[PDB]
Amino acid sequence: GLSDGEWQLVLNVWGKVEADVAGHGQEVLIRLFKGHPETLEKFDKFKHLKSEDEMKASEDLKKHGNTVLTALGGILKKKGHHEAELTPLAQSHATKHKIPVKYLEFISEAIIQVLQSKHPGDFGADAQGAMSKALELFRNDMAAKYKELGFQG
Numbered sequence: 001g002l003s004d005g006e007w008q009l010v011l012n013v014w015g016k017v018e019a020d021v022a023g024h025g026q027e028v029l030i031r032l033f034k035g036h037p038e039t040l041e042k043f044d045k046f047k048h049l050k051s052e053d054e055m056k057a058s059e060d061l062k063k064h065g066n067t068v069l070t071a072l073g074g075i076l077k078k079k080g081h082h083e084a085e086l087t088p089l090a091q092s093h094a095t096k097h098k099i100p101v102k103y104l105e106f107i108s109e110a111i112i113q114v115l116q117s118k119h120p121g122d123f124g125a126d127a128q129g130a131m132s133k134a135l136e137l138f139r140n141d142m143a144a145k146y147k148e149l150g151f152q153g
């Protein structure tokens with residue numbers, strides 16, 4: 001997994017995110033969308049946004065983003081022991097939202113791109129690998145539940 005040190009780099013870069021969840025959330029969504037338009041399609045709720053400007057205006061985009069990052073935040077802090085937490089999430093996304101794991105991959109990227117854009121100073125070579133490792137662990141586990149739930153294999 002992640003060493004204890006790796007988990008500390010992660011918990012650390014994450015306390016930056018917690019001083020502003022809604023704004024970090026909002027920018028990760030914008031980037032994912034601007035970046036994988038198709039992922040945009042998954043949200044009824046947001047298909048109708050046609051420009052960055054539009055995404056940036058959306059109260060509800062900003063709120064969905066808080067929610068996404070509040071939920072990851074809660075997983076991250078279990079530092080690995082996030083079975084109880086990952087479950088509801090893999091259930092909902094596998095079966096209701098129908099999110100492919102590739103998408104999880106896109107978001108991970110979106111998330112890392114925001115931390116680099118915003119915390120270049122706190123998000124060095126080490127914070128970088130800590131973080132991406134924590135996120136592949138998360139995808140990998142998501143992935144696992146899918147397989148079992150009997151999904152995208």
Ligand code: HEM
Nearest residue numbers: 039042043045067068071072088089092097099103104107
């Ligand atoms: C770090 C990755 C993610 C986290 C922590 C996350 C978290 C959440 C949470 C907490 C909810 C609300 C509760 C629930 O339905 O279980 C939700 C809903 C949803 N998620 Fe995600 N999600 C992630 C990635 C994605 C991705 C990549 C997509 C698809 C592009 C996605 C699509 C959706 C949709 C369509 C909804 C329903 C929102 C609505 O329309 O009310 N999520 N997600």
